Amino acid sequence: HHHHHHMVHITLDRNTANSWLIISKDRRQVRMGDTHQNVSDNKERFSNYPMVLGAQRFSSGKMYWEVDVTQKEAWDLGVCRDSVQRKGQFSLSPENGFWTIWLWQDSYEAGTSPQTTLHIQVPPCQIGIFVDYEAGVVSFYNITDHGSLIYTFSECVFAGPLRPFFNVGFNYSGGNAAPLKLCPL
Numbered sequence: 361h362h363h364h365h366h367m368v369h370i371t372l373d374r375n376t377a378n379s380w381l382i383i384s385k386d387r388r389q390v391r392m393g394d395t396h397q398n399v400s401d402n403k404e405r406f407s408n409y410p411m412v413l414g415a416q417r418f419s420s421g422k423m424y425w426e427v428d429v430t431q432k433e434a435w436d437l438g439v440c441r442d443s444v445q446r447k448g449q450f451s452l453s454p455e456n457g458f459w460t461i462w463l464w465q466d467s468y469e470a471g472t473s474p475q476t477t478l479h480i481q482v483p484p485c486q487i488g489i490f491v492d493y494e495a496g497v498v499s500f501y502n503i504t505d506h507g508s509l510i511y512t513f514s515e516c517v518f519a520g521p522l523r524p525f526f527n528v529g530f531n532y533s534g535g536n537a538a539p540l541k542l543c544p545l
């Protein structure tokens with residue numbers, strides 16, 4: 361693809377993080393802690409899942425960023441409405457304000473309702489995410505496989521400002537401790 365020139369510098373918003381997440385000083389990496397991270401609760405924090413938002417809000421234009429997923433067993437990535445539900449149980453779907461893909465149990469799926477099987481021959485170590493606000497498009501690219509397309513959500517109805525969305529996943533197995541990292545431009 362040729363979206364690299366719309367690169368944006370994303371940083372994580374501490375205040376939105378689940379209370380078990382550890383965000384690096386530079387706000388560019390996040391991982392699951394082995395306990396509560398000694399923060400106060402607030403209405404912004406994702407309560408049920410190890411999720412966090414980017415600080416940046418997008419309401420126009422074209423935006424591109426990359427995320428490192430090396431050696432993780434489980435994760436969710438994409439964008440969401442600024443006003444998504446934070447508390448309790450919910451599914452990742454466009455009806456709920458999310459445009460996401462994930463890894464779970466050795467398969468990759470797009471967060472449609474119901475979910476869509478992805479066809480990935482080369483397991484990605486870095487994922488590229490492209491958003492065209494006006495066109496209503498969110499696309500995912502396999503940076504490890506020369507930028508090959510993973511999935512395109514089209515005819516998106518954003519219905520609000522968008523925020524970068526992350527889920528580091530649980531670490532029940534002891535094999536999913538590795539961080540998500542925002543990769544340099």
Ligand SMILES: NC(=O)N1CCN(C(=O)c2ccco2)CC1
Nearest residue numbers: 454455456513514515516517518
């Ligand atoms: N039933 C709804 O009201 N939906 C919310 C908006 N939708 C989308 O943004 C979308 C993009 C790709 C697939 O769905 C469709 C689902």
